[PDB]
Amino acid sequence: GDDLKLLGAWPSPFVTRVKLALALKGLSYEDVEEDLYKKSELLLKSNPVHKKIPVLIHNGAPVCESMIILQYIDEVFASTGPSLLPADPYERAIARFWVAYVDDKLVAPWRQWLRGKTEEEKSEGKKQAFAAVGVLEGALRECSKGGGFFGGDGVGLVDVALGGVLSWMKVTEALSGDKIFDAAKTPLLAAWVERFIELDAAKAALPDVGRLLEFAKAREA
Numbered sequence: 001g002d003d004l005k006l007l008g009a010w011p012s013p014f015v016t017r018v019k020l021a022l023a024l025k026g027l028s029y030e031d032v033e034e035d036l037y038k039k040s041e042l043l044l045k046s047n048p049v050h051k052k053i054p055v056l057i058h059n060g061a062p063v064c065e066s067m068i069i070l071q072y073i074d075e076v077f078a079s080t081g082p083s084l085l086p087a088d089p090y091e092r093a094i095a096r097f098w099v100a101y102v103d104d105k106l107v108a109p110w111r112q113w114l115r116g117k118t119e120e121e122k123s124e125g126k127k128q129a130f131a132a133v134g135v136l137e138g139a140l141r142e143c144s145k146g147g148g149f150f151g152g153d154g155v156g157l158v159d160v161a162l163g164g165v166l167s168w169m170k171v172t173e174a175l176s177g178d179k180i181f182d183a184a185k186t187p188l189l190a191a192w193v194e195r196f197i198e199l200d201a202a203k204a205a206l207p208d209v210g211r212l213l214e215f216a217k218a219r220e221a
């Protein structure tokens with residue numbers, strides 16, 4: 001039939017996205033843990049170009065990059081469970097637009113906030129991350145259509161893209177003292193966070209914040 005194996009390291013948000021996607025469709029797969037200081041031959045041969053996770057392996061064939069994997073699953077397993085992407089080409093473009101926004105205007109500056117070298121750098125990342133969240137709120141306002149997700153009535157691509165970093169966001173709040181989806185500024189997003197984490201898929205896939213936090217504090221130190 002179809003064997004699926006996910007190569008990942010549990011703290012990675014990029015892995016978390018793929019786990020959400022698999023869980024959303026109810027797809028069974030083997031979850032394989034990779035040590036990034038001692039990568040397996042299967043990892044090194046499946047993603048020789050970046051040697052990064054996640055990597056989904058389907059019947060022995062690798063697919064890399066979290067958002068690409070998500071669409072690969074959407075297309076191959078269309079007849080199984082809900083789709084992350086809409087049917088309509090316009091709607092699909094818009095969703096891809098916001099995924100890109102998330103990656104470039106949110107996740108990247110957030111990374112800089114966290115692993116920035118100079119304090120100014122940490123501070124600019126932070127600043128940018130916050131401005132991005134205010135823009136994402138307007139996107140949710142326009143995409144919910146009363147269902148509450150970036151995908152409308154069901155979880156979509158954008159929801160997963162963002163959803164994958166939610167454990168890290170909570171960890172960030174604990175380290176910094178700052179609330180990323182502060183309800184007073186971004187009430188729609190604060191409520192979206194609560195709706196998302198309550199999904200069964202999210203419960204199965206998002207990493208534990210306590211462990212995540214210990215892991216983070218050791219890397220910061």
Ligand SMILES: CCCCCCSC[C@H](NC(=O)CC[C@H]([NH3+])C(=O)O)C(=O)NCC(=O)O
Binds near residue numbers: 012067
């Ligand atoms: C586990 C700590 C979490 C830190 C965030 C980095 S996630 C791990 C990192 N992978 C990500 O960079 C992949 C990004 C890729 N754009 C995706 O979307 O799938 C990796 O495998 N890096 C390989 C390596 O570090 O050797």
